[PDB]
Amino acid sequence: MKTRKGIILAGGSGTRLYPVTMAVSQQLLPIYDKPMIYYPLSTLMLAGIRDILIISTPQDTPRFQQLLGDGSQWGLNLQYKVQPSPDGLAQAFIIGEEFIGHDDCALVLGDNIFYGHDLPKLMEAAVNKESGATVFAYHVNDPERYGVVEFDQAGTAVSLEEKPLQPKSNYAVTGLYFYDNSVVEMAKNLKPSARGELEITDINRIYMEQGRLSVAMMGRGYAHLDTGTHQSLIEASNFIATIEERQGLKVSCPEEIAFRKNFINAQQVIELAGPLSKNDYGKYLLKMV
Amino acid sequence: MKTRKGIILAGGSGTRLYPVTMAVSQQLLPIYDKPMIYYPLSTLMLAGIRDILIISTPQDTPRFQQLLGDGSQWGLNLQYKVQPSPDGLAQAFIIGEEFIGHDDCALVLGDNIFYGHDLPKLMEAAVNKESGATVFAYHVNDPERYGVVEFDQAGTAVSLEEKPLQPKSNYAVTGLYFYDNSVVEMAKNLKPSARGELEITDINRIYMEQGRLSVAMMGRGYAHLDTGTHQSLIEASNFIATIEERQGLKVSCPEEIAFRKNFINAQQVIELAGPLSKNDYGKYLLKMV
Amino acid sequence: MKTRKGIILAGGSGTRLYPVTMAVSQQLLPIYDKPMIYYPLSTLMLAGIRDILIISTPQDTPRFQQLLGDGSQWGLNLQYKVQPSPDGLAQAFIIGEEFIGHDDCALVLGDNIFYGHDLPKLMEAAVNKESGATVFAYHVNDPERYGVVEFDQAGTAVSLEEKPLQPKSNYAVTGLYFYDNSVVEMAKNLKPSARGELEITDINRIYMEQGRLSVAMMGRGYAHLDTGTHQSLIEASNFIATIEERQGLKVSCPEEIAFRKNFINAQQVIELAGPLSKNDYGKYLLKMV
Amino acid sequence: MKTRKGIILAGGSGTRLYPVTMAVSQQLLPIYDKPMIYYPLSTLMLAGIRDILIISTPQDTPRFQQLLGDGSQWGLNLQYKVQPSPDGLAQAFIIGEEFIGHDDCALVLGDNIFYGHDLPKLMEAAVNKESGATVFAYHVNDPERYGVVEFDQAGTAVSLEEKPLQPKSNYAVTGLYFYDNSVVEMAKNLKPSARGELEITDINRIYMEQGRLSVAMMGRGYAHLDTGTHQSLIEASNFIATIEERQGLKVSCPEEIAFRKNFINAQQVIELAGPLSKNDYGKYLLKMV
């Protein structure tokens, strides 16, 4: 029993993306060749996670369910739940309390795109840590926007601040977290912040003080993207297009990852790629086996 | 009589774009900072057309209606009608027969993106043509994919073929057409081709055989874009992003066009810019007035 | 142009019914007062379908042709084609590609018996849906045997599995399907399943993901029969006998349905019932007019 | 001499069963778990008869041959001969004259189903009778339909009439008869009746007038079934289904009878049970040995 359950928090309205998000849900927007939701979903599968709860707005939840179903086609077990109002990342564990039960869990933001040659290994370690938590961070130019993590002369994380007026560093904690079961009771005791939200940073600070928090780095060989603005969104799509078209590889293709993790076998892949063989998406899969 | 009516055919399922078009209508996909449907709408607007019929599938028509409404916000009159199945472009005149009536009509595909400094002047002539039809052709590398038009030494159109295995030229007829009322009766008497579709090319050939076909060239300063594949889709988005960011202008922005053409006043622009004031899209509108 | 064409897949060997099927084709076995084939045939006529292709084994195909002919006696247009080997339900659209052409179609299993006071209405809706598909489902005690459809807390179908080891529900998709023209291209891209067959469920899952699939229920007032075993077969016959003998009505009598749907007139019915007036079969018809 | 020869008359067209008998021979229709022909075959088998002639129409004879073959699989010797037209039951002796030769013969209708615990003992006496004939009578409600036999106070048969408008009793003579060699010459000298048929009743009356007619009662524990109509057909099937399912026994199963009577051994039973091992029919055979 380890981090066998995951949650994808895909709520919000994406107002900064208007008018593109007036007709399409942000997490359904394409990132080159696939819907945005495929990326965070692929991140959890890479960690060996099959039981995944997707939390979204009452309007967008059914659209994700139509696209993905129960995930059985990829050897997954997808569930869904609505978030009435975006009260904060931490509320994910409140809404997913029954789903999580007594197991470990992982949380990823539905609009964060992760990629890196060593990503699988990086998360393998996070999954094998049954007590405590693991967060990920990387350098940015606008730390005041995200949760910040400060290290010491050695290289240990000693502080965390949610959007500090004067950041202690430029290392922001990304939207990917791995917790043990104690995270549920933590979120239930949290109180609203200055902005009236249950902060994920308040939970991570506790694991830190207990000395049970790992802070893995997503630097040097990792992709650092943002889907928040029209400009950042297209940059993200260009990144994916560039690596897929120039290096001949697929990034966050759930059918491929499901095969690699042995969620589905070769026969199943061919069955899935059959109907999709009209474009290179299905052809790549047919070549894979 | 000036052409004051237009039809935007935004149906289909865009299989070549799977899986992005699985839970999202192709014509709703973003093209950098706005949904695809905005582009062809703008084209008709630049032609002075304000009475527009939008045809889509029974599943997608309601989504466009939810996005564009009646178009009154832009001083437009938008109507909707469903196309049961993709039986051909020409079927838009049979579906929109009641819409058209006795007036001339324009047809533009919902996934075609037109941009050019002289685009308005180019269509101004087509809109003012008394009797006959006007199409546009431009050079491409894969003519076999589109409707092909061949010219004679004099420079007159003498041959029209749909996806010829042996193209008699490299000039493709794009998805923008201006017809007089006689098109309706033409479409009604059309018989499906091998693929069982009411071919627009058959219509154009009829106008040509009658010697009433005008073919305006859309070369030089005109954008030649395609939204058929993931690769060409991102190229289109990059085109728009590049022009807007480096030349400080908006391509096919309904609010700006409606203003520049006086369809709406300055007070209204501010109202529309409000919900979009979080990004450069809305701010551009505020700065405009 | 709607679902005007139908296919009856009546192949197989019915080995589980041996030795009864050693001398008689399964679809010719009597279900009380009429041959089994009359039921699925009557289901398509009730949907207003007149152009019907019957697919069967090279041995049994000519026997159906002898019994039914070209169906002109009932205002139908029956065609026949042989299926060399039972490669799967989906192969029906491959074998019937020329027959289907560019029209919509419906597929029914030759050994499924449907009945219900509201059946006509239920299918009327399915026939009027030109884009997408409609499948039917009902509760069972052995879901692992059929295609399973899972719904959500609301009441929408969100998943489909062909004989799941651990069914998500007890709602099996019966042998009755209505598709648009896109079903042909779908079946041609399908790949064999674990059992080496082209699954109808693989096609239905695609319509589901596209949000173009309707899942009508054949519950409460509908008959739920099975012709697979000696025990189920006689139960099915007893059901028909019971309703016909105790409620004085005919179930799936093609001459009656042909009259009700106006395929044939009163004079034609009398002409047909004349020679059959030796038993109550022809007498009922003579009384009907 | 014991009667070691039998004739099964399985011709006709069964018009009363239309339309089930249109493309299917009446004697091939299933009676729950086996074709009708199996029942009368079993009756002769229980009487020790192994040399059997099966007479049917020119169109159906080949279908029975395809089903039963030569009967060697059951240690039987089966032969086939066609009956051009339905000129009467007595014509079976004229057609089978060469088959019969100088031996006694038994005649059973192909659509008559006999079952009774004491049935074997009942026929054992008839088979061992030296000279004369033996018929069977039982009570019915519509004697006018069958051959009627009246008894005197002493209990002796004194009157035989075919379908009497005014039956002198309610005892019908069933379709099972045991005759000595003199029947052949009797049949040959028979003159057709009003309906132009060689009446079996005329034959039986001849044996009666000579004082050589034995009439065994087939009442009490004997099944009285009729396959003439859809209603009585399903009642027969229900009878068999009920006895087999509730009393765990098979009615008229050739494989079991051939075994119980040692016509075939246990090794052979297994061979025959193989192709039937998918249902309770074959499994019953395997469990038997």
Ligand SMILES: O=c1ccn([C@@H]2O[C@H](COP(=O)(O)OP(=O)(O)O[C@H]3O[C@H](CO)[C@@H](O)[C@H](O)[C@H]3O)[C@@H](O)[C@H]2O)c(=O)[nH]1
């Ligand atoms: O209750 C909520 C809150 C957020 N979201 C969505 O989750 C994503 C989060 O983006 P955002 O609101 O801008 O993140 P912040 O809340 O500002 O900050 C959190 O997410 C950052 C990563 O973007 C971390 O660096 C911070 O430490 C963490 O506290 C978006 O798509 C939101 O719409 C929900 O669905 N429900």
Ligand SMILES: O=c1ccn([C@@H]2O[C@H](COP(=O)(O)OP(=O)(O)O[C@H]3O[C@H](CO)[C@@H](O)[C@H](O)[C@H]3O)[C@@H](O)[C@H]2O)c(=O)[nH]1
């Ligand atoms: O009945 C129909 C047919 C098409 N479309 C839509 O129209 C666009 C056209 O795409 P597609 O059907 O694949 O193009 P073709 O029909 O193969 O070709 C037509 O469009 C080309 C430009 O793209 C022209 O060059 C050709 O001459 C013209 O016949 C798409 O967004 C379709 O979904 C509909 O909505 N309904």
Ligand SMILES: O=c1ccn([C@@H]2O[C@H](COP(=O)(O)OP(=O)(O)O[C@H]3O[C@H](CO)[C@@H](O)[C@H](O)[C@H]3O)[C@@H](O)[C@H]2O)c(=O)[nH]1
């Ligand atoms: O290539 C084929 C396959 C089947 N059949 C016949 O069609 C009927 C289908 O019965 P069966 O083989 O047992 O159905 P399955 O293939 O096990 O499953 C299909 O039929 C079920 C209804 O019985 C559905 O619930 C499932 O979703 C669907 O995939 C039978 O009379 C078959 O002989 C053919 O004629 N040709």
Ligand SMILES: O=c1ccn([C@@H]2O[C@H](COP(=O)(O)OP(=O)(O)O[C@H]3O[C@H](CO)[C@@H](O)[C@H](O)[C@H]3O)[C@@H](O)[C@H]2O)c(=O)[nH]1
């Ligand atoms: O030339 C003939 C006559 C009959 N049959 C078959 O024999 C069975 C008898 O049916 P049917 O002809 O309708 O019965 P009847 O000839 O009217 O009556 C006969 O069979 C009855 C039992 O069913 C007896 O009671 C009567 O005395 C006897 O005359 C059927 O399966 C017939 O197809 C033949 O194959 N060939």
